[PDB]
Amino acid sequence: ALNSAVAAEGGYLVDPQTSETIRGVLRSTASLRQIASVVNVEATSFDVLVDKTDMGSGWASETAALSETATPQIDRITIPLHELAAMPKASQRLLDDSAFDIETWLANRIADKFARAEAAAFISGDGVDKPTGFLTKTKVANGAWAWGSLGYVATGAAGDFAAVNASDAVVDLVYALGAEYRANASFVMNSKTAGAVRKMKDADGRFLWAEPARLMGYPVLIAEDMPDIAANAYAIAFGDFGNGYTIAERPDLRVLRDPFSAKPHVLFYASKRVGGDVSDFAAIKLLKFAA
């Protein structure tokens, strides 16, 4: 019962208090799920039905004998609706003696890992066992825009932005996207692209671009899965993802604790299943740095 600094003379009674909730490193939740079309679906697939064309009108005369006109042709896009599963191994000695609720901490942390791991598939994912991101959708340069492709505009100089008229590749990308889709559109970038855009400045040293972290009035999603400013990379995307990109999923996270296979372990098998590609090809434009 002496001082509380040396262990022997009354320093073992000090009993440090642990935290209330076990904390963690906090990673990026800008996941493109909050700007796309989220659809609950309990099936093997989800089949959106879009129209790649429109009709025709007449401006009929008084005595005209009005003939046939066009009628929109329909395209079905099949969401494959893959699954995303993780199975961490936890010890039964830990779970009985580790008074934090480890079941709900893993149910928070696996769900965080899934909401971060599906954000890679929504942007740069390929077809195999994962949703195909919008970057892997056979881009064709804007102006020669067919339906089965996404449009890009090119900046000029090969590595960086344009040499003389930089920031003009951004604005024709904005006004090359359609008047209706720009009513609620957004940039998507990663942070070391947004830093390079913010470092652009005028001839006198002042940076020309004056929560939403918005640029030119339109919101910006700071992702972390888009490519950086490379030779032929698509570092900046812009579009109305609420019409453009469809995410198909189930709004639950299935947990199965397994004290049976790994016998002194608990082995939480957790899975959610999620799918999605683009639904409207006209609603996303890209910024290629080629020429």
Residues between 200 and 239 that touch a copy of itself (CB under 8 A): none
Burial category of 152 from C-beta neighbours within 10 Å (exposed 0-12, middle 13-18, buried 19 and up): buried
Does 280 interact with a copy of itself (rule: CB under 8 A)?
yes
Instruction: Output the smallest distance, CB 284 to a copy of itself, in A.
Output: 13
In angstroms, how far is the first alpha carbon of the chain from the final one? 78
β-strands 220-223, 186-190 pairing = parallel
Could you give the 3-state DSSP secondary structure of residue 42?
A: coil
Instruction: Decide if 198 contacts 236 (C-beta within 8 A).
Output: no
Nearer to a copy of itself, 3 or 203 (CB): 3
- What number of other Cβ atoms are within 10 A of residue 222's Cβ? 17
12 binds a copy of itself (CB under 8 A): yes
Closest distance between a copy of itself and the C-beta of residue 87, in Å?
5
Shortest spacing between CB 237 and a copy of itself, in angstroms: 18
The residue type at 243: N
Hey, what long-range contacts does 157-165 have (CB within 8 A, 24 or more apart)?
Answer: 157/289, 158/231, 158/289, 158/290, 158/291, 159/229, 159/230, 159/231, 159/289, 160/196, 160/229, 160/289, 161/196, 161/200, 161/289
User: Is residue 147 near a copy of itself by the rule CB under 8 A?
Assistant: yes
Among 140, 179, 210, 215, binds a copy of itself (CB under 8 A): 179
Strand partners for 40:
249
Q: Which of residues 120-139 bind a copy of itself (CB under 8 A)?
A: 121-123, 129-130
- CA nearest to 287, candidates 239, 217, 252: 239
Kindly tell me which of 20 and 202 has the beta carbon lying closer to a copy of itself: 20
For the CB of residue 81, give the shortest distance to a copy of itself in the complex, in Å: 8
Please list every residue from 14 through 53 that binds a copy of itself, using CB under 8 A.
14-19, 22-33, 36, 39, 41-53
Query: In terms of CB distance, is 169 or 248 closer to a copy of itself?
Result: 248
Size of the site for a copy of itself (CB under 8 A): 109
Contact 249, 32 (CB under 8 A): no
Among 279, 285, 288, 289, binds a copy of itself (CB under 8 A): 279
Site for a copy of itself in 46-105 (CB under 8 A): 46-61, 64, 66-76, 78, 82-91, 93-94, 97-98, 102, 105
